[model samples]
Every structure is written in C-alpha cells, then in structure tokens.
Target chain A: KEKLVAIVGPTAVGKTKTSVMLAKRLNGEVISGDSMQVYRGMDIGTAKITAEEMDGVPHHLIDIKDPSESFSVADFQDLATPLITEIHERGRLPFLVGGTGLYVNAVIHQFNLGDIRADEDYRHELEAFVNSYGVQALHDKLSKIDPKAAAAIHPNNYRRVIRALEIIKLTGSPYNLVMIGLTMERDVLYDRINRRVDQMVEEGLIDEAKKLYDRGIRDCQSVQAIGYKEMYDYLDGNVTLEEAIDTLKRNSRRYAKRQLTWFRNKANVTWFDMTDVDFDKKIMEIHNFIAGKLEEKSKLEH
Target chain B: KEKLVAIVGPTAVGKTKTSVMLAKRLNGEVISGDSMQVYRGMDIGTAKITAEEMDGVPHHLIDIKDPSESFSVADFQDLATPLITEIHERGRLPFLVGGTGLYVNAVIHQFNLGDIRADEDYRHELEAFVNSYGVQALHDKLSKIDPKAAAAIHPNNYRRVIRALEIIKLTGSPYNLVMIGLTMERDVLYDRINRRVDQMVEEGLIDEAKKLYDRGIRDCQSVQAIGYKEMYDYLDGNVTLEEAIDTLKRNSRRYAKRQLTWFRNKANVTWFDMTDVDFDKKIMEIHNFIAGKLEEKSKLEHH
Candidate 1:
C-alpha cells in the first residue's frame, strides 16, 4: 500500500469527487486538506460533502472542529498523520483531498514547523500587525523576505500573509514549492463558482448560517464562508438581501481565483480539463499519472 | 481604549485569581485560551469558571463549542482576534486569559496564517520518510536546511519539523525570532500540576467526562484532551480508575516540562521566577522589558 495519494485542484474543480472515486477504487481513505472543511457547521459554504456523498469512502479531518475554535496546520498534521498511519497499517491507502495548498504541501513536503508550541502572544502580535498595518503591510514584509510567495498570494488575504510570515519566523524556511494548478480558462472557472454559489443558496445556505448563528456560533470563522458571511451582513441589515446574494457569488468567484493563484506556482500539478470530458475518464487519467509517479518514488526510495 | 490585555502563565501560577482581580479592576473581559473550556457540557473536567468564581467579570471563548468538534489554533485566532477588536472599540478591556501556549501565541503574535491550506501529497511524502527513516531522519533533514531551528527544537517532534519545512517551502524566509519562555522552579510547576489535577477531580471531572462520553462525543477532540481522555478510558473499564488518574497527572506534568523546554531555546524570551517575591510586579517588569524592546524596533524601522 502507498503511504499517501493527494487529489488537489482549485475549488469547484471536482477534486472531492475525484478523490472519493480514487479512494474507493484504490483501497484508500481520504484525508481532507482544506482548512475550512475541517470546521463543523461549515458544510454548505465550504461545500463539505455529505456522508452519503462519501459513498462509503472514509474521510479524515473534516468536521473535526467548530468555526469558533482554533485549528492549526500543526494540529491537522498531528491528528491526520496518525489516522493515515492507521489506514496504511491496515493495508489500505491514504488519499489527501481538498484545495488547501499549504495543508496539502505541509503533508507532502514534511516541513518542520518547530515545537515552539504556538506562541499565542507571538501570533497575537502578528495578527495585530496585520490588523494595524493592513494586509498589504504584512504582504510587504513577506515580499522582502519571500518574494516568490508574496507574488503568489494577494495581500487582501490577511490570514495567509500572517501565516507565511509566521512560518518564516518559526522555522527559517521559505514557502517555496513547485505549484501545481488545476485550472480552466478564467471565465469557465468563474462560471463554476457562480453555479456553486447558486447551488448553495438553493441548499439553504442562508438558513444554515442562521441556525448556526442563532446557536451562538455568531461572528467567528464559520461566518467568514463566502456564502454565509454575505448573508450574515444582510441579516444584520448591513447590506440588502439581493446585494448579499450577489456578494456571495462574487466572493465565491474571487475565492476560486485565489485558490487558483495559490496552486498556480506548483509546477508539478498536471491539469486535466473537466470542461469537456467525462468526469470518470478525467479521474482515471489522474489516477494513472499519480500511480506512475508513486511507482517512480518507490523505485527511487528502495 | 486598548484591546483586552491577556495575562497568561502555566497552571497554578496564579493566572485565575490574577485574571479575576485584573478583570474586576480593569473592567476587562477575560477570554480563556484553554482548548477544553469551549465545551458546553464538560465543565468540571475543563475547570470552567463559574460566574461566582468569575467575581462578576465577563469572559469570552468559553462554552462556545461542543466536545465533538476539534478546535484548532487558527479557529481561536479567528474568533478571538475579532472579539478583541470589537471589545476595544466598545471601550472595554479585552484580556486574554489562560495557559494554552498555542492559543495565547496565536492571539498575541497575530500570525498571518495563509489561508488554511495544506498540500496533502507533499505531507504524504514527508510522513513516508519519517515512518521509514524515523523522526530523527526528518529532523536531520530540517537541521541541514535550518540548523539554528533544529538546534532549538527537539528531534522527537516531527509535527513541528514538517511545519518548519512547510514555511520554508512556502515563503522562502529564515525563521529567526526572539522566543520568550515563562517558567518557575520545576518542583513548583509540578506541584501545581498535581494540585490542579486533584482540584479537577474534586470539581467533578469524572462526571463531566461521563456526560460527554454518553453524549456520543466520545471520539471527538474532547476525548483527546489529556486529563479527560485518561479518565474516560477508566470510566469505560479500559483501565483501573487509579491508573487513569495517575496517567492524567503524569501526562500533565510532562506537558508542562515540555512546554518549558520548547520555550527555553530561541533568542528572545526572558525567564521570570514566579517563586520570587511580588510575582505580579515582576510580570510588569517583564512587560516593561518587552515594551522597551518594541520601542527600539520602532527606532530601527525609522532609521
């Protein structure tokens, strides 16, 4: 059994479907790498798959947390690594899924995050910097240190810029990896995002957010979801209902673009176009590509 | 008005009482950074503060999640940061209170965690290497790339190793920061841990774990907690009750020591002796030291 097989791509690109299929076909379980999906009650907005959708395939690290609580990449590695080992020990494979590039890369590349135990004080200082200096200030600090990453990640994402700097401060390592982006032309990807957002609305995304918010999950990371946050502002009378829906679509589209940008720098990801092909066939092609690479890895290792 | 000021130290080092006093005096709301307190049902085991115990002070980030969900550092930062900002805007002092190092650090450092993304394929390769070559092999790999960090961190922690490497791969910068470790004498800390464990048991820890376990939150991250996990196993007839309690105490003690060691290395942390007279005054002294250094940073930036 192989140690790990990763299925990665931009949002709404069928990565989850492909991963589930691969895990089922290949005697593997799925370990999610998306940061958002790890939180509970973030299902609709994060597009978290249903248990039925899992189709009898086991997935690790999803719905493991509430949105108000903290989840770190370190926590992900700690919890999921053990599960992967258990799966491998049982003569099964582990398939890494989702669109979170850093989480996926953390697993694949084995970056040493150091055992400094998270200095909440240090992290607080960093967040203060982000809030005070603006996301761009953090980005500028990163640009001076790691220009490659700074170029790759937009400054609008305050969370990411702070994380990049934190890693640099913690481990003396750069966020340099061969980016593999699974993308279509921009308009096509945008169409997918728009459709996904619309589907979320139909699935009662606004209702879901309301239920969670009413349950005191108000004003946390869960609310930051593209579909939910916009609705929240609308519900709070900060924006019109129609405008909120539009914001949801636009934010979802923007999020997709950001996802693409994050993975764009990874050179090894071979993109398979799902725009015109059968989904099953595309999955098979990905399987073959990964199988070939794993065989090569084994040859080199042994 | 400034954001809430969080005053944190390890267990039994006067955090709770001091926080109460500070909150009462400063009109500050104390938000707990402990991972366990977020559970609605598991109070005694989590040592949750009652309103009476709170001395009429407000606290945030407690009883906010169920036991089934595993909270992460990112979640803490996400929830607490905004609360601090909001509290500051409202003219109330927001003081972060608790002993969880990771949570505290995330709040204070403002770590710009890149969108919580992970590269699973890369992680797989790293895990495979560790499984085959042992954690030290991975540690050596990190040491070769970042010797200073390697020297600072122990070899047993592969989780941190992979994190360090991930940052390097993602951002391409050296992690060089002055680290501060807050500590007291080892015997004193251990004594505190033991007493805290006893206090938790007295406060109905066993019942708390039982409630969570009966509620189908048995396999959730709440069960992964040190004190409750051992106790739950005991409740489940997996181990003798005494054994479980002993394990809880031992695990907590070891955890405290590990926390100390983790902070001991690196460049910047100044250790204070809580056993010394006027520990709170000493804390202020330490704060002044940090403030002075930060002021110097402003000078350097300008020049």
Candidate 2:
C-alpha cells in the first residue's frame, strides 16, 4: 500500500497553500484535515481556499457536514479510511492538510475511534439539562465521575462532554490521547496565525459567513468557524468589524496553541520545527525519516 | 467557600452506595456524575439508585435531561457550578459521585468550556462533506493541514473533527490538554468490571433497559448505556440472553481498558489503588489526602 503524507502545524502556518502546492507537485490529491473546511459556506472564515487557489489540484473532505449534526471521532475514522484506500488505488499521492490536530492525527496514528456511536437522545437530554441547570452544575456532575477527563474538556463544550460520556456509555474510554506533539515557538506561530486571519478577512470571510447566514444556514456547527462567527457578530451589530477581525486573529493564534497542546503528549509523534526554513524542505527531512521507519514496518509485516 | 468532595471510580466500585452512606454521615448532598443517569426515563440501564438506594439523601444532576436531548461539556459545566454554590449555601458538603471521567474532572479542574460555542453551519457542511466524501478523505485533508493532530484523533470520530474545527475556529487553540491516568492491574480490574456487569444484571438491569425500550426510548444515547444496551438487544431479539449477558461482561471489561488508556496521559491525577483494600479505609485515605490539599489551598490563598 502507498503511504500517505500529512502536513500539519498550528493554524496559519501556511498549511493550505503549501499543501496545495505540494499536492500538485507530488501528483497528489489534497485532503483537508481542517475541522471547519468540511462545512460548506464556511469558506472564508475557515480560511477555506478558493477554487482558484487550489490551482486545479483535487481536494477532498471540505464542506461535508451540517453544523447541527453531531459528528464524532468514530465517524471520522469510518469516512477517512476508505478515502485513503481510494487515493492510493488511484495512484495519487494522498496529501493530508489542516490545523485541526486531532482530526489530522487520527488517520496516520490509526487510533481506534470505533468504540462509541453518537447518543443523540442522550446528548439532547444532557443539553436540556444543561440549559435548565447551568454549566457549572453539569460540570460538577462530570467532576464526580471522571475528574481527569473533566480537567481536559472545557465545560462550555457540551459536545465534548457528551462525547466523552458517550464513550463511557458505549466503550467507557476516558478523553485523552497520548500522542507526541509538534510545535513552533508561540510568538512565532501566533504571528503566522494572525497573518492567516488577516488573509481570510481579505478573502471576504465576512461575505462568506453573511451568505451562509442569509441562506438560513446559521445555527449549525459550520457557522461556528472562528472567522465566520466573528464576522457574523460584526454583521449582527454585536461588535465592530475591526474588533471582530482582531478577535478572529487573536482566536486563531490561540487555536494554534491549543492544537499543539492536543498533540503535545501523544505517545507516538515526534516534533519538528519548520520555523527557520522552507516548509517543504523540512517536510522532506521528516519524510525521509519516516520512510526509514516504513522499511522497518515492511520488514515486520512480511 | 465550603469545599465539595467528589467520590468516583469505575461502576460497581460502590460509588452510589458509598456516596449515599458518606453523604448521610457528612451532611452532604450527593451530585451524580454518571452521564446516563441524568436523563429522566433512563433509570434501570443507568443503574440509577432509587430514593430507596439514596436512603433519603438528596441527589443532583440526575433525571435532568430528557432522553431525547443532546448534552455537551458546556452544559455539564453550566449545570454543575451553580449546584455547587447552592449546596454550599445550604451548608451541605456537595459530594459529587459517579464514574464519567470528563464530567467529574471538568468541575474539579475548573476548565473554561464556556469560551467557544459550536457553529451550526460549519459543522453541518463538514458533516455533509464527510457523509458524501468519506472519513479517509476528511482525514487526508486534516493530515495536510495538521498532521500531528490528525495522528492523535481517530478518524471514526468525525464528531470530534467537527468539534476540533469548531474549537480552532472559536478559540484558535489546539486540541491538546494535559493528561492524568487511573489504573489497576488489568486482570483485577477486568474481574471487577465483569462482576459489576453481572451484578447490574442481578440488580434488575434487564428490567431497566426493558422499561426504556417499552417506553419507546429506543435508539437514543441513553439506551446505549453499557449495562442496558446488551440487555436491550436481548429483549429486542437481537441476541440471546446468555450472549447479551456475556456481551455485557466483555464490553464492560473492554470499556475499562479504554477508559484507563484515555486517562493515562492526562496532565495530573493522583492515582489510587482501590484493589483489594477495604472500601471505607480507602475512602478515608482519599478524604484525608483531599482535606490536606484543601488546607494547603487555604494557606496559599491567605499568603
């Protein structure tokens, strides 16, 4: 089987353009590893590359889900595996790209996400309970059962808690993965994130979100794309456009940090820095290192 | 501020029975941390302790969400925080009890889950794309943008993908958190898990899942409760009774292992061995340890 190549880093680290370029160069199809890009009409805010930006390279897994629909790690594994096979079968290099660390890692690491299915009813029940009772009350409940997991998940993220609980219900796993992390220095990465957010704004992120809002595609998960949400607030008169844009930049920077944190402790990953050099050059170095491991893997397999 | 104490561990580790007994002795109100028990009609399968099981102690966070509603971490935090305050105001020791690790740790850790709310449109478009294009396709995309993260998340969890994307969109933060793990020797823990499953069956788990199924609460997250689902399948003619029971045992054991793995890498948790020790003695040791920490916290606050 042909191995896939993944390009990952914090948000705004030039992942999109680089991956697209790499895809075209490598006879590869670009697979979006971004969480938000999978949603339609979330283009600008999610920093969704325009069709023109793709430079004619095929892209997969963008604009796929409804915001209101709850998607899970299990769903990601179910959907991503066959595409990897298909990409390889078609003799195209599979180039994975995105800033969503967990989703990106899921494929290469082969972590088993099959343990639980969505508990829509349980989730609903929990949602109503939270609305009535309050976030703290629900968090308090989580603390009593799984303190370690509760520490990792924010209480406002009910989707995460419910998912964690869903795991407990279905497969009883806690909410942590011990993968190794990849990171750049924070200030450096933050600058990149800020620039990316600025680029998205210039790309008409506000118009993209406005179009989605106008289309009545407002309240689902896709609209929650950071860039889109900030723009929506600006449009809704909740914040000044400048403030929204600034917030998007700040939030994107923070998101990059969090993405690093999510990958920091994974047992398998080894970190590399692309700060001082070209991304492709650094990626090539990593690729060579991984190729040696692949040979080891083949020897073991046979 | 009055301190709240939470007693937790795996199911059948005597959380309910012990928490109730501890609450009565400590003038505390028990707040359940079990995720499934919060639903109103999810009594039996959730292993919900009845008023009789409570021995007349008050409980919080149970029978709160409808069986049909979706719940999130934010919801859990939103509900639990005020309850703690109210319990403390009433001069009760708020004792949180149950085994859902995420819910339990969220309160104790005081995480800022309220920061980012999910975007409906972005999520939906992603879901539709995944549905049409497939998970590998989605993951391939992730790999290109965030390979390190893609390595961490399993592809089966597109829900998580949506969430990761949402979080990144909202906070610009990565999805990593420090990890803490709890463990027991597998053989020992598996035995406990197996015994617990059998015990739930004996304790009328069949009747519990049946009641929910009979009530037409089929196909919800609540019905999938470990003890309930296997039995529910049997009742629904999806499996034999023996097979259901065996499945329950195997599932529970497997779940414990996964749970341990999930927690194993978290940031910091003081692990305790609950194996072969006297339950009360173990509880007392934990109590002493926590109390000492609280005293240390007060001192630090004053300083």
Interface RMSDs of all predictions? 15.2, 14.9
Provide the clashing-pair count of each candidate structure.
Answer: 103, 173
Give interface RMSD (Å), model 2: 14.9
Summarize candidate 2's per-residue lDDT along B40-154 as a digit string, tens digits. Answer: 8666556678889899899888888887665565577788878988987998777767656567667776776432234555554565566435566777677676687678789
In model 1, how large is the Cα lDDT of residue A219?
52
User: Residue A284 error for model 2, in Å?
Assistant: 70
CA lDDT of each candidate? 0.68, 0.65
Which candidate wins on DockQ?
Answer: 1
Cα lDDT tens digits, model 2, A171-247, are 23111111223466778888777777777767777777777778777655566555667777887899998898888
Judging by lDDT against the true structure, name the best candidate. Answer: 1
Residue range A1-302, candidate 1, lDDT tens digits: 33576656767777767777777767878777776788886778778889987999988788888788755566676776677778878887877776455567666666664433334555556654442234556789889988987898877665677676766665441212222235677788788888888898898888887887778777554565556778889878899978998988887777677666656646566666767647767777777776677677667667
Q: Can you give the DockQ of every candidate in the order shown?
A: 0.07, 0.02
lDDT of 2 at A300: 61
Task: State in Å the error of residue A19, model 2.
Answer: 50
